Structure 1
């Protein structure tokens, strides 16, 4: 197995996947690495299994159909994996914890949002459809773009949104378009 966390790329107290060489800090894996379970399979492996069981799940889908899906166990897992893929980028640090807003010429957003809040919301089964999860994720980046206006720091929101959107299209097998 790897000797660094797949998510944050640091060593430490690591839990090793039994079916692939990845390793994880306890609270870097989503969901948090389970207490017992021998063997244990990581989220990457669990997602691969879904695909392998239903090859047709990789045919193209419309975004509007995906968003309306209820959060049954497979869709719960897919959103946990998509959230984890965002944390995998180091620029997620900017969006992880609760933001505050005090900048001359700007007003903070009406509905602040951050990654750890989405993480808690998934853990607590607060989303009933994929749409709820995707709306809160996109809100993170939209709040950032609006607040930072023409400061070059706005780009960090474009960058992490692009990681989110690419991973959304991959995980949920969104139909490719030009």
Structure 2
């Protein structure tokens, strides 16, 4: 197994996947690494299993259809993984914890949002459809773009949103387009 966490790329107290060579800190894995279970399979392995059990799940989908899916266990898992993939980028640090807004010439968003809040919401099963999760994720970056206006810092929101969107299209097998 790897000697660094897959998500944050640091050593420490790591839990090792039994079915692939990835390792995780306890709270870097999503969901948090489970207490017992030997063997243990990581979220990357669990996602691969879903695809292997239903190869047709990789045929292209319409986003509108994906968003209306109820958050049954497989969709819950896919959202957990998608959230994890965003945490895997180091620029996610900017969007992880609760922001505050005090900049001359801007007003903060009406509905602040951040990754750790989405993480809690997933953990507490607060989303009933995929749409709920996707709307909160997109709101994080939209709020950032709106607040930072022409500061070049706006680009961080564009960057992390692109990681979100690419991973969304991959995980939920959205039909490729030009």
TM beyond 0.5 = yes
CA distance in 2, matches of 1:84, 1:48: 15
Q: Equivalent residue of 1:144, what SS?
A: helix
Residue number in structure 1 paired with 2:128: 128
Q: Equivalent residue of 2:159, what SS?
A: helix
- 1:41 positional shift: 0.1
Deviation per residue, 1:103-134 (Å, 9 max, x gap): 00000000000000000000000000000000
CA distance in 2, matches of 1:125, 1:29: 17
CA distance in 2, matches of 1:79, 1:4: 24
Deviation per residue, 1:70-106 (Å, 9 max, x gap): 0000000000000000000000000000000000000
- Give ranges in structure 2 of 5+ residues lacking alignment: none
- 1:49 positional shift: 0.0
CA distance in 2, matches of 1:115, 1:56: 31
CA distance in 1, matches of 2:85, 2:63: 19
User: Structure 1 length as normaliser, TM-score?
Assistant: 1.00
Deviation per residue, 1:18-55 (Å, 9 max, x gap): 00000000000000000000000000000000000000
1:151-170 aligned at under 5 Å gives the runs 151-170=151-170
- 1:172 positional shift: 0.0
- 1:138 positional shift: 0.0
